[PDB]
Amino acid sequence: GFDFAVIKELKTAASQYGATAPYTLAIVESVADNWLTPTDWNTLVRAVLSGGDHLLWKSEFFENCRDTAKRNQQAGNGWDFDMLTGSGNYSSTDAQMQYDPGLFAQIQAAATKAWRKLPVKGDPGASLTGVKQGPDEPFADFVHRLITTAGRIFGSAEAGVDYVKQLAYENANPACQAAIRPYRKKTDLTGYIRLCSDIG
Amino acid sequence: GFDFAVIKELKTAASQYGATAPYTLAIVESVADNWLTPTDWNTLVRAVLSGGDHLLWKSEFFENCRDTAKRNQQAGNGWDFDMLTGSGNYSSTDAQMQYDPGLFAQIQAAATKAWRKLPVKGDPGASLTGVKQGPDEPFADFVHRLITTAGRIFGSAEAGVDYVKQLAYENANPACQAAIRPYRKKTDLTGYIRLCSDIG
Amino acid sequence: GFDFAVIKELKTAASQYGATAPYTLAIVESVADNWLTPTDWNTLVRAVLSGGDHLLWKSEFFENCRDTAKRNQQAGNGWDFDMLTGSGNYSSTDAQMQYDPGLFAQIQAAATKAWRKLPVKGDPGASLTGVKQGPDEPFADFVHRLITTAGRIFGSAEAGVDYVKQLAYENANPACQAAIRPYRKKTDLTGYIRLCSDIG
Amino acid sequence: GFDFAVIKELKTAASQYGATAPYTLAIVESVADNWLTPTDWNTLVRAVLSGGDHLLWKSEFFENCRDTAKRNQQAGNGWDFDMLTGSGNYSSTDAQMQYDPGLFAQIQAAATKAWRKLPVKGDPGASLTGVKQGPDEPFADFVHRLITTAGRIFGSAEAGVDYVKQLAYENANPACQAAIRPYRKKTDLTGYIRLCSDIG
Amino acid sequence: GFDFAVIKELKTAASQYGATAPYTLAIVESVADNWLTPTDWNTLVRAVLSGGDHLLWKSEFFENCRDTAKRNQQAGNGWDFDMLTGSGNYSSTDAQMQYDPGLFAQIQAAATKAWRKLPVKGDPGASLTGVKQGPDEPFADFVHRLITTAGRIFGSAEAGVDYVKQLAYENANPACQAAIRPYRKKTDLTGYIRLCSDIG
Amino acid sequence: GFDFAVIKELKTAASQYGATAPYTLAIVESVADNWLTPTDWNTLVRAVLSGGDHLLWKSEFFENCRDTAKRNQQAGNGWDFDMLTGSGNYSSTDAQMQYDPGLFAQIQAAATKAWRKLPVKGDPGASLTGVKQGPDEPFADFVHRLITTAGRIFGSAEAGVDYVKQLAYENANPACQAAIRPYRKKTDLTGYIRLCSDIG
Amino acid sequence: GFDFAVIKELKTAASQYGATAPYTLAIVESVADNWLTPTDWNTLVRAVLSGGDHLLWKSEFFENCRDTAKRNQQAGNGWDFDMLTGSGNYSSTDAQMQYDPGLFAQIQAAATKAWRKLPVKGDPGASLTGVKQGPDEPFADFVHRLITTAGRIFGSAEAGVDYVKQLAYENANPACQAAIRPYRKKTDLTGYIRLCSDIG
């Protein structure tokens, strides 16, 4: 089916998380769940994504998939042109929907393979390590935001380290961080959540 | 074909990088390139991997793939039992090799889908952030090792940050780090490669 | 097949590890993988091993296996003499190879049962607890050697204890141990690998 | 024939020298020596190179070469579609190998023309002017490396100038450069090779 | 067609830039655009160029092109003598114009291949690094001249470096350079264009 | 008709003004006035412009225009392939000129729609806010240049503001600006044109 | 037969020794040992050598050898055109191999005569008299290198003279030469080999 808003949302996450974050490809493959055409899949993506990424993925589609077609006719499928074009001649919606289910397996695998291929820019997440917690904002909630998105981008929650500790420290508001740095070194989450829980 | 050593190597990388590092799944899908049986694929993996991971992936194989079979017979493939068991009745090597190429697409997609599913433990890389550069070891080569594997695990080379700077610092030998910390703060790779290039 | 060198190697390990170390019986059963004659198995072992061990195992073979034959003819196998002698009358290589596969199961089980029976001397590993690390030798590599072989003999890596700590200590070179004992008590592997990493 | 490693090597040189260094195009035209298909030539290059470069060169291939086809049919060749597509309809390996030798001349000229067209990024060589000679590394060998690669990139050995002299100076180790700068100004290669030839 | 003046101009650029500067071969291949005879091409070049270069290129023409003819008759072109002489027997203008278009591809490729081969002297550009800006001449325009021609010869605009900075410095008039050297070190183009913009 | 020089000129303005300045699209649509082929329009633009921009615009041409073709055949035009390819099969110049005038309306609208789509880099005008008036150059003429081009890029003459006042100030020569800043704050164009009108 | 590497090696020696050193012509005549075509001999040499040398030798070949042909037909050989062209009409490999053995004598003599004719530049050996022994390098081995190559170029080992003595002296490292010059004048090889045999 046509996913509209969640597509927009993953595009937003793609610009913040990058088309490499376990998040993004997880959602990719999640949407790939449905028997549907790569044609509109890719029109959709080039709508959210930017052109050359798209057309490159689809050109490598043509190349590798028609090599697969070589193999398929070595095995003798008798296919690979029309659907395995994205749209060959009359793939107008349903005429493309005429997929073989194993042909659907092929097309879905190829689309996700493509999407898997091309590299992201390489720097959409800097915000994570960046400025701080907002001063008025609650601290532990900010830290929770931090570790959750750090798992999102780093790929695991188990990135937490004195690196992450001083990341939160610098990111804490001047009040809370100014309490923590004189508080102790080797200070753990319990100390922070204990201390800075007020407004004043 | 039977990949032996590189399989061993990815298993080693899986215990160090984890079955989440872009490295590991990249190699997974790279090996998935060949028309072959998921049966020996999975026997291989359960040989390198540990059992429950394997049999769980293959049970979810059965479940989701026989739902796919529901759909396939809604479309009317007339298949999904024998090959889409891993081995149904007489999948003895070649009799399994009797795959439909679209059936191969399905099985490869399902295997990689499974492997994609289950979570790693969550902490095979601690060594990265860990002890140091060896004292006798050359420093810049160590740093190169660091950023390369940091890209391996973090998923991008663009993790480098004053975090990574003090990571190298602590990791540098007492000589080089003892030169760098008095040297300057805000010190970049050029400074390190400049300074500590000797033996004495 | 004829394993030559690895047999020699396990014999070496048997004199150092003893025919009790999980290592040795693991390799025993690993070699037992093949449909082959206990005859040459045992000629091989008595070649590496020493006679009375061998002939005793094979005498208990005769005894328990011919009791098994009692049972087999209670069930009525109609066998147990020729092959279940090791060589009865014309077991000359292939004529012995005429094994029943369930007969092979029996013979392999009996051979490994025998090998399992007789006791080792009781002291081939003293070297482990013994003299030291060589002075010029690297320390942490020595310690790694220590814990690996300690797992080999003790049967688990989880023998490591302040016992093992002072074992390494005494075993460390006079330099490193003379650094460690004044360094601290309750000192862990991190401390050792940290300190003694040099040559001078 | 299939050049594998040297292709990898020129790709490495392309990232260091750039697809403009006399080196790179010299090797390009050197490989172009053989009667072979631009199809796999270009698949190869897009394998080493990055996509848009490739497909752009091949699109301009289509454009200019089909203008050439205009001319060819003004002269009346009766060709330019199938081979002069890269693969028109059945250029499957040998069916493409069905080239006319003058048609091969055309295709080789067109491929090299394309490759000649598109511009490099513009900065893969900075290393040349960059950090230094390694301190332990021998100096004159480093200088030799310098002038050789300077010829590689600049296109001639006759770039050597007091620019290059102070380039080597800065690049020399602190020992050798600290000897040379007090040594003299207007110092030539003979002076450097004379002075810094030791270890200490 | 007969290019007269631009040929003269590239010859001038060849004596200043050398028959290696991306400029010169770019113009070479640009003129090669037309279906025409290598005969007058080469008469033209030996008119601008100097003899041995020419006749050497054309001798290697004969050699490599008649090896190509070997191959062509292995493929069976049935040609290579008359046109693939430059003029065999009756190549008098139009009778040479009787080229096959694939034969034209061959001849153009061969001519440009030749021209590509032979080496320049090795030092036509010294003027670039040389004397200075004229004193009365405007400085920034001179610098623009510098970087443009430096791109011409070096092959890229990205040669600009403190080398090029002191090149302009020395090249600046005594007034402007005498202002700049006391002005600052690490001075960029903005500083120069800012300062020396006057006459007095 | 073939516009040559003005095309070059708009390309120059595109690199200085950007393909967003009201100037550039005004000229675009001005040239679009003529019944002509998008084919050569786009060959022209990709000649001045850079490839991916072009081919992207034309790919979106294919996509949206063949959706328009969907609609056209819902209305039943019976067209959209050959001309609405840019060149389908025999669009060789006149055979493309066989456009329907409403088909020309479509193609012109599509071409300008494309050109309208893709984004400029985002920074070709910095010169505007940049260095200054040349010292010898007349001031008010420079200011006139400023406001005219500021209208060109900003899209209106009504950008003039104390921002623009200090822009001219900084841009004025040291003489004139050094007269104006002590002259007054809130100084208008009349003051500047009054004061700095001399040479000395 | 095709000598590849040794040809490369003599070319290297030709650039260092010059095509006059007894070495080079000795190797020339050594290779001339085989009944083979001067055609590929000369293609080979012009591959290692540089063109005008080659074609000049072969032009004088034509001249003197066709004078020899004058004489041959005064004696009435009835030959000298085809083979005594290098390749007359159908000297394609074997058809050239159709040499008369006395004709081979003629062609070999002519080729070596040519090669004997033309003069070397006149200065490829300066290195010999040049910089020094490397400081770390062993001295007597360096001296051995010296006299061996001095025999190579000078044509005899009996060049050794107080000239050669001070050549080695200057060439000795500062240590050894600084020992020798105060050691004695009229010092012979025995003194040097005696003294400087150490490292320190």
Author numbering:
A (entry chain B), B (entry chain A), C (entry chain A), D (entry chain A), E (entry chain B), F (entry chain C), ...: 19 to 218
Task: Copy text verbatim from the article accompanying this structure deposition.
Immature retroviruses are built by the Gag polyprotein; Gag is then cut into domains, and the resulting CA capsid proteins form the mature capsid, which can mediate infection of a new cell. Murine leukemia virus (MLV), the prototypic member of the γ-retroviruses, is commonly used in comparative studies and as a basis for retroviral vector design. The CA domain and immediate downstream residues mediate protein interactions in the immature shell, and, following proteolytic cleavage, CA forms the mature viral capsid. In this study, we have determined the structure of the truncated MLV CA-CTD by X-ray crystallography and have resolved the architecture and CA lattice structures of immature and mature MLV particles by cryo-ET and subtomogram averaging.
Intermediate- or high-resolution structures have been determined for the immature capsids within a β-retrovirus [Mason–Pfizer monkey virus (M-PMV) (4)] and lentivirus [HIV-1 (4, 5)] as well as for virus-like particles mimicking an immature α-retrovirus [Rous sarcoma virus (RSV) (6)]. Surprisingly, the quaternary structural arrangements of CA domains within the immature lattice again differ significantly among genera: although the arrangement of the CA-CTD appears mostly conserved among RSV, M-PMV, and HIV-1, the CA-NTD arrangements are quite different. The general architecture of the immature MLV lattice is similar to the previously determined HIV-1 and M-PMV Gag shells: it consists of a hexameric arrangement of Gag in which curvature is accommodated by the presence of multiple small defects and one larger defect rather than by Gag pentamers.
